[PDB]
Amino acid sequence: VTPIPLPKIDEPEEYNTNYILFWNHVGLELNRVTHTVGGPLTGPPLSARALGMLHLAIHDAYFSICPPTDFTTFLSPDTENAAYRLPSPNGANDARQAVAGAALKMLSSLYMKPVEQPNPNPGANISDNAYAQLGLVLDRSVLEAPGGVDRESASFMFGEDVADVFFALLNDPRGASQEGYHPTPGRYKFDDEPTHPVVLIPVDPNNPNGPKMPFRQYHAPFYGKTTKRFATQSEHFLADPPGLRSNADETAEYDDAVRVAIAMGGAQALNSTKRSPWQTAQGLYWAYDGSNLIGTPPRFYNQIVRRIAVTYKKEEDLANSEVNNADFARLFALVDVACTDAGIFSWKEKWEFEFWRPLSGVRDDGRPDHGDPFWLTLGAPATNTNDIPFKPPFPAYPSGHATFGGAVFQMVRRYYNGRVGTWKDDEPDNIAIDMMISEELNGVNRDLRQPYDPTAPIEDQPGIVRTRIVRHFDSAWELMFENAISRIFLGVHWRFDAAAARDILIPTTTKDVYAVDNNGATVFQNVEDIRYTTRGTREDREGLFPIGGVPLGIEIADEIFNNGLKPTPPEIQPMP
Numbered sequence: 040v041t042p043i044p045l046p047k048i049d050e051p052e053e054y055n056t057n058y059i060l061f062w063n064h065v066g067l068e069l070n071r072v073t074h075t076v077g078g079p080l081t082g083p084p085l086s087a088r089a090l091g092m093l094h095l096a097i098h099d100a101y102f103s104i105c106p107p108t109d110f111t112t113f114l115s116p117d118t119e120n121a122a123y124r125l126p127s128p129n130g131a132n133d134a135r136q137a138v139a140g141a142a143l144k145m146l147s148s149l150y151m152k153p154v155e156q157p158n159p160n161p162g163a164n165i166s167d168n169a170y171a172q173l174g175l176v177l178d179r180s181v182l183e184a185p186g187g188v189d190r191e192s193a194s195f196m197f198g199e200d201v202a203d204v205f206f207a208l209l210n211d212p213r214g215a216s217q218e219g220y221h222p223t224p225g226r227y228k229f230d231d232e233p234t235h236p237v238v239l240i241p242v243d244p245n246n247p248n249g250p251k252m253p254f255r256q257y258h259a260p261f262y263g264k265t266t267k268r269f270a271t272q273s274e275h276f277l278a279d280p281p282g283l284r285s286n287a288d289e290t291a292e293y294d295d296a297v298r299v300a301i302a303m304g305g306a307q308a309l310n311s312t313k314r315s316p317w318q319t320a321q322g323l324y325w326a327y328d329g330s331n332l333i334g335t336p337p338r339f340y341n342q343i344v345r346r347i348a349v350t351y352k353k354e355e356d357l358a359n360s361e362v363n364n365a366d367f368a369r370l371f372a373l374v375d376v377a378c379t380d381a382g383i384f385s386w387k388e389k390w391e392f393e394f395w396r397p398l399s400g401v402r403d404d405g406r407p408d409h410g411d412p413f414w415l416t417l418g419a420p421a422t423n424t425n426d427i428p429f430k431p432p433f434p435a436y437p438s439g440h441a442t443f444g445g446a447v448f449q450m451v452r453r454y455y456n457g458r459v460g461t462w463k464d465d466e467p468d469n470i471a472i473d474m475m476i477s478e479e480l481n482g483v484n485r486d487l488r489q490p491y492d493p494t495a496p497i498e499d500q501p502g503i504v505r506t507r508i509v510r511h512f513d514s515a516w517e518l519m520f521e522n523a524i525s526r527i528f529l530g531v532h533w534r535f536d537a538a539a540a541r542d543i544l545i546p547t548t549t550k551d552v553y554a555v556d557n558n559g560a561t562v563f564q565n566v567e568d569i570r571y572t573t574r575g576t577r578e579d580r581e582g583l584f585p586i587g588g589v590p591l592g593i594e595i596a597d598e599i600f601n602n603g604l605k606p607t608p609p610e611i612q613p614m615p
């Protein structure tokens with residue numbers, strides 16, 4: 040087992056002298072490694088879930104040893120229901136070791152090879168190498184942990200017991216299963232993406248150079264409807280997308296969404312592409328579409344939140360401050376739980392509606408004055424591989440990115456309001472950051488000329504290097520907005536997958552048709568002016584519902600925070 044050479048992270052080394060940030064970092068390393076080797080917990084919703092689980096375990100371990108005043112542990116040690124009962128410390132008094140035990144046990148439980156009975160799903164089998172690569176990440180982390188790991192300490196053992204409770208309660212090992220799901224083709228209907236209709240996978244994952252079999256992937260079609268939610272207190276729902284159900288009559292909106300999709304999301308060289316070079320950069324910056332050495336969007340959102348956390352920390356000392364430890368333990372629990380539930384509800388809605396992606400909608404439109412049967416997108420970047428850009432293997436509405444960003448950045452806003460500045464709950468903040476680099480645009484990662492070599496550093500492999508782009512942002516509101524519209528620029532989402540067009544685009548005197556510049560490129564409202572307020576109807580449910588991923592994530596974050604981070608009541612979990 041030759042270890043994957045992981046490239047340098049653009050972050051100050053001082054961050055990992057904090058033990059809360061250190062274990063977050065280990066979680067992110069496992070995220071990017073698992074997406075390089077084909078391990079467990081791949082894909083956006085489940086990778087979010089792993090981080091939520093990590094940070095809940097860290098949170099309750101830490102706050103058992105260091106009791107907070109403004110909130111409580113997520114689980115109570117006094118609960119009668121065994122499944123929800125937090126272990127007691129019984130003399131254990133070392134928070135650093137409690138956190139190490141919780142983090143290590145949780146991450147080992149999540150990423151280790153399952154023992155006996157051969158727990159492996161046919162078509163979703165994981166190689167021995169993949170588990171070994173992840174094991175090495177964990178082993179290396181033990182030696183790097185600031186202040187060390189003492190496995191014999193009572194506090195460490197207490198942390199492990201905390202992890203065991205959370206793992207038993209919240210793990211969903213087969214949550215991403217696709218057994219029995221099949222597309223139902225037709226107008227507006229999700230189906231195999233035409234540039235990647237089938238993939239060849241090894242018959243035996245431990246013989247990768249051996250015989251192959253075709254596979255049609257559908258990412259987690261049952262997860263949203265069946266999995267246990269973390270901290271939400273209701274079910275969340277979106278308006279019918281234009282073209283479907285109660286909004287089947289929104290023809291002007293749908294037709295203009297097609298026009299905008301072509302102009303803003305097409306391949307670089309197409310005569311019909313009106314996107315600017317800067318908008319390409321905005322598209323790629325936020326991608327993290329499961330690529331080698333990069334992982335999934337929750338990894339990027341955590342990288343950003345680490346910078347926010349250190350920028351706005353209350354004490355200078357990252358190593359020896361209980362104020363900083365408590366601050367980070369609480370923030371990352373709030374953020375990664377919100378990211379988890381955002382994954383659940385975005386997936387639930389995605390598979391409820393089964394709305395097609397722009398590539399298929401544009402190609403299969405069927406009307407000469409609207410469609411283009413030969414259109415190509417900029418696409419989800421296939422970074423650190425020789426593969427062509429793609430369409431993520433799940434339905435369009437709402438965008439996962441949009442929802443995750445809504446939840447993560449609204450949570451950051453609720454947490455820091457009063458501290459960094461003051462704003463109304465739904466208005467722009469001043470949580471600015473600088474020197475923020477995306478691994479999609481870092482001067483190191485690349486579009487390779489040949490298949491990725493997992494035994495060599497990325498810099499030693501021929502390819503076209505991604506330009507290094509160092510960013511500043513004014514606010515979490517800006518982060519949330521740009522993250523959402525990035526997907527329009529890639530051509531992987533409709534405008535309404537992000538938010539109501541009315542809330543992000545500039546209107547004209549024609550209803551549902553939005554402004555373009557002299558070249559036909561879409562104009563956006565200024566960040567300071569953006570309000571996610573525009574609602575729509577549902578065929579199956581009375582009332583007014585948000586449109587697209589951003590307001591879905593916002594509402595999830597607000598509900599979680601308003602309830603002080605407490606578990607979803609057992610009685611409202613899915614049962615069926």
Ligand SMILES: O=[P-]([O-])[O-]
Pocket residue numbers: 431434435437438439440441526531532
């Ligand atoms: O759901 P999406 O942002 O590819």
